[PDB]
Amino acid sequence: SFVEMVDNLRGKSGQGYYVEMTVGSPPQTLNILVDTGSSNFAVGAAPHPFLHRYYQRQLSSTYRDLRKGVYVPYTQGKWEGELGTDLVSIPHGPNVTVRANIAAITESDKFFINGSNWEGILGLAYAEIARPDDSLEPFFDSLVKQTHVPNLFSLQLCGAGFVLASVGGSMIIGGIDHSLYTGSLWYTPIRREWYYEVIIVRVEINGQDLKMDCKEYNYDKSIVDSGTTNLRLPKKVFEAAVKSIKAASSTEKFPDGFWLGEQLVCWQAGTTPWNIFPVISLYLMGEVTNQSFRITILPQQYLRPVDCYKFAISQSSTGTVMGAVIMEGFYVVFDRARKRIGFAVSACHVHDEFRTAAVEGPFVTLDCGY
């Protein structure tokens, strides 16, 4: 029953959303980051200064060694571990237990976050991008193959809403909970099964078209990633977006350290002038070729609380990333079975009495992909 699954996520602002899981026998309780942007189930399995608990394979009667190592260097840092399998459950998820691959992390750099309260990562994306290669079946694939759970999951990330702010949300596995959203669910195709890749066909700031060749919005790809905090945009698009946002909020000036996403700005208790910042609309490709639908986000989503805030839109060199701050406005359905992603206005999204996040379509757009 989906009711048991409601509010099963927690986190700290800017530090990811995590769900409680158990690994091994007897069950070892760990908090695990819900990450649609990667494809390994990777868990701290050795002492680390930021870890207050970790996976102890020797304490597990059901652990099985794969006798194989894994090394994952990446932009921000790296992680390194040992492959095996064990029994895994999600206490506030489906009532099943699965045998899944587990990368036991033995060494890492800049991977874990101080005080985040999670000890591992659940990569929900596809095998194509699994480390060390695509033969290592990802968790969700094992779950679907081993149980009768429908090949779909959905995420309602709620954020903080009014010490880093604590956030909450829901991960519904195997279905769609109609109490978590209002209005219509609109679907955009999954272009390819590796990341959750999608196509953006245009973007507006306060109703004003950025007027770019749509290839620019997806250069070199566009993905939906619960494991990225910000909305990240390709250089050309980022610059155009900030120019427009700057002009919209011209009354009142901020330092470009703020626009560069590393400097906070503060008002005091309920004085924040939301009405000065514009809304942002991303139009996603519809299931029908010449159609699209728009998701519209507010400043309440793209100014992340830290009353202090940081600009949560930043530049990318690896394509558009629709991260947590974009997802927070919405109920997002990862319909793997039908190769599509749905968006509907979330029952929990933060907004004032003049504006609201929105999902609206269709818009007919009469080649946007990389």
Ligand X SMILES: CN1C(=O)[C@@](c2ccncc2)(c2cccc(-c3cccnc3)c2)N=C1N
Is there a contact between 300 and 354 (Cβ–Cβ < 8 Å)? no
> Which pair of structure tokens corresponds to residue 294?
């728009």
* Contacting residues for 311 by C-beta, under 8 A, at least 6 apart: 258, 259, 260, 261, 302, 303
Rule CB under 6 A: say whether 229 interacts with ligand X. yes
DSSP state of 206: T
Stretch of residues binding ligand X (CB under 6 A), selected from 68-76, 237-245, 298-306, 340-348: 68-76
Half-sphere exposure of 114 (CA within 13 A, CB side): 2
Burial annotation 130-149 (CB, 10 A radius, 16+ → b, else e)? bbeeeebbbbbbbbbeeeeb
Per the rule left: phi > 0, alpha: psi between -120 and 50, beta: everything else, 236 is alpha
Residue with Cβ nearer ligand X (97 or 142): 142
SS3 label, residue 164: coil
Is there a contact between 97 and 22 (Cβ–Cβ < 8 Å)? no
Residue 360 CB, shortest distance to ligand X, in Å, is 28
Q: Which of 135, 156, 196, 165 is nearest to 322 (CA)?
A: 196
Stretch of residues binding ligand X (CB under 6 A), selected from 34-42, 86-94, 268-276, 342-350: 34-42
Residue with Cβ nearer ligand X (43 or 237): 43
Which of 120, 159, 227, 299 is close enough to bind ligand X by CB under 6 A? 227
Stretch of residues binding ligand X (CB under 6 A), selected from 43-51, 153-161, 224-232, 294-302: 224-232
Burial annotation 161-173 (CB, 10 A radius, 16+ → b, else e)? eeeeeebbbbbbb
Stretch of residues binding ligand X (CB under 6 A), selected from 35-43, 100-108, 265-273, 305-313: 35-43
Choosing from 134, 177, 220, 225, the catalytic residue is 225
Residue with Cβ nearer ligand X (54 or 111): 111
* Contacting residues for 32 by C-beta, under 8 A, at least 6 apart: 18, 19, 20, 21, 41, 43, 118, 119, 120, 121, 122
Binding residues for ligand X restricted to 143-172, rule: CB under 6 A? none
Is there a contact between 157 and 132 (Cβ–Cβ < 8 Å)? no
Instruction: Give me the count of residues in the chain.
Output: 370
Stretch of residues binding ligand X (CB under 6 A), selected from 29-37, 135-143, 164-172, 296-304: 29-37
Half-sphere exposure of 219 (CA within 13 A, CB side): 14
Is there a contact between 368 and 285 (Cβ–Cβ < 8 Å)? yes
Which of 13, 28, 38, 320 is close enough to bind ligand X by CB under 6 A? 38
Is there a contact between 199 and 189 (Cβ–Cβ < 8 Å)? yes
Residue 264 CB, shortest distance to ligand X, in Å, is 17
Known active-site residue 220: no
User: For the window 88-127, what string marks contact with ligand X as x by the rule CB under 6 A?
Assistant: -----------------------x---------x------
Residue 230 CB, shortest distance to ligand X, in Å, is 9
Residue with Cβ nearer ligand X (44 or 278): 44
Residue with Cβ nearer ligand X (214 or 327): 327
Is there a contact between 174 and 336 (Cβ–Cβ < 8 Å)? no
Residue 73 CB, shortest distance to ligand X, in Å, is 9
Rule CB under 6 A: say whether 72 interacts with ligand X. yes
Residue 37 CB, shortest distance to ligand X, in Å, is 3
Known active-site residue 213: no
Rule CB under 6 A: say whether 35 interacts with ligand X. yes
Residue 15 CB, shortest distance to ligand X, in Å, is 5
Which residue has tokens 């202090």? Answer: 308
Catalytic positions, please? 35, 225
Binding residues for ligand X, per CB under 6 A?
15-16, 33, 35, 37-38, 72, 74, 76, 111, 121, 225, 227-229
